[PDB]
Each structure stands twice: as structure tokens, then as C-alpha cells.
Design a protein around this ligand. Sequence first.
Ligand SMILES: CCCCCC(=O)OC[C@H](O)COP(=O)(O)O
Ligand SMILES: CCCCCC(=O)OC[C@H](O)COP(=O)(O)O
Lengths: 118, 118
Amino acid sequence: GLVPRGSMIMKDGIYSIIFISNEDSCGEGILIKNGNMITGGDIASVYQGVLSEDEDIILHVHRYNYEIPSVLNIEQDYQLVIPKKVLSNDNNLTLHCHVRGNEKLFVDVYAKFIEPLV
Amino acid sequence: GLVPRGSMIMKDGIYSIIFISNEDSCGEGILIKNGNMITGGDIASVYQGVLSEDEDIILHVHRYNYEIPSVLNIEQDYQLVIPKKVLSNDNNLTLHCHVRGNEKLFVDVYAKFIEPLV
Ligand SMILES: CCCCCC(=O)OC[C@H](O)COP(=O)(O)O
Ligand SMILES: CCCCCC(=O)OC[C@H](O)COP(=O)(O)O
């Protein structure tokens, strides 16, 4: 069962990810966590961010394929605020991320651990 | 124009990737390069490997979603041999990777630089 935990407790490795926005659009992708470094992406955008802990966790989203819609329909680069706390297991976690400066724009994410780093 | 170069010359960062196997199947995904570390993945599989240089570059492929076909139809984990040399620019590169132990099983990959690491 999931339990409130610091997102920074996440095991290092590669994660599978599924999300849905407030626009009711879905997307899937990959997420990698090293130290505090978080990098990932899908067929249309990529994202990087550093697990804060003393600051708000900002996840920089960069659209690299405009021929494909954005789960948020922003049509440009933007920032997502990553919660300090998350509901998780040793291999699972979910979180609600909203666009920085507009909590009406968000995505609910489910992350599944796939394997550790080499 | 592309020119033969050591795959280890690749700039660090996140790359967009497109590939086609000998089975004539296509796939797209993301690839990250740090030091010699290479991690990436798509909607059905993920991959890790360390840029060799003194050894054969082995790229460990792990299927994490069997509900989706594999560009190679292997139906399990396997290894790809990454060439020491690659045709590339500062933001582009292509390579031919075959399954370790069977050069008849391969994928031709095109990688496009998206952005550097934070
Ligand atoms: C560390 C937790 C992962 C944060 C979630 C995340 O980065 O999701 C990607 C986001 O949905 C990308 O949306 P877009 O492709 O519509 O721009
Ligand atoms: C460093 C250069 C990238 C190597 C190419 C690569 O890892 O491709 C992924 C491969 O096509 C995955 O195939 P699969 O999803 O059918 O198992």
C-alpha cells in the first residue's frame, strides 16, 4: 500500500510513467533518477529537475516535437512544481503536479520502478 | 554532414531517437548520456549501457511492457552491441546495432540532440 513519503526517498533507477492532465489527456513516458537529478521524456517533450529539499522542486519541461499535442496544450516550454511529499511504495508512487503559477493546470502521475542504474 | 567519430564523443544530454529493425518495425524513444553512462527507453522497453573504449559497448535492453510488441520480437531481455564508431555531427548521429550473438537481428538508429543536462 502507498504511504506519504518524501519524493527524495525514491530508489535510483529507471521508471515507467503514466499521466493525465486537467484537460483529460493522457501520456506515457520514461523517468530517470540519479542522485537528486531527474531526467525523462516522452514522444513530444523531455524533462529535467533536481530533487529540492529546501526549495520547491521545479521540473523543467521542454517540448521537442510540436507535431504532437501536449497533454496540457501549452504550446511552449513550461515548469511543473513537484510536491515534496508523495504516496509511494518501494516500486510505486503517484503525485499531482501543477504548472508553476497556475494550479488549475496539472497532471496526475503514476510512476512504476523498472530497474536500477548500472 | 555526418562523419565517422567515436560514439564516446557524443555531447552529454538528452537525445530523441528513432529506429527500425531487420523485421522492418519502427520505434521511437528517449536516450540520455551522462559520463559514459547511457540510459533510455520507450513505451515498451528501457536500456542502459556504459560507453566502453577498451571493451565492446553492451547495451542492456529490458522489456517492461509485454502488452506492446518489440521492434525485434524477442519477447525477453537481450543485449545490443553498440559500435565503437558512428556517423555524426554535433547534434546528430546514426548507428547500426545488432543483437549480441546474432548479427541478423539488428536496428538502425538515428539520434537527435535535444538539450544538455542541468
Ligand atoms: C518526478 C515526477 C515526474 C513529473 C511528471 C512529469 O514530468 O510529466 C511530464 C508531463 O506530463 C509532460 O507533459 P507534456 O508532454 O504535455 O508537456
Ligand atoms: C547508444 C545508441 C542507442 C542504442 C539503440 C537502442 O537502444 O534502441 C532501442 C531498441 O530498439 C529497443 O528495442 P525493443 O523495444 O524492440 O526491445
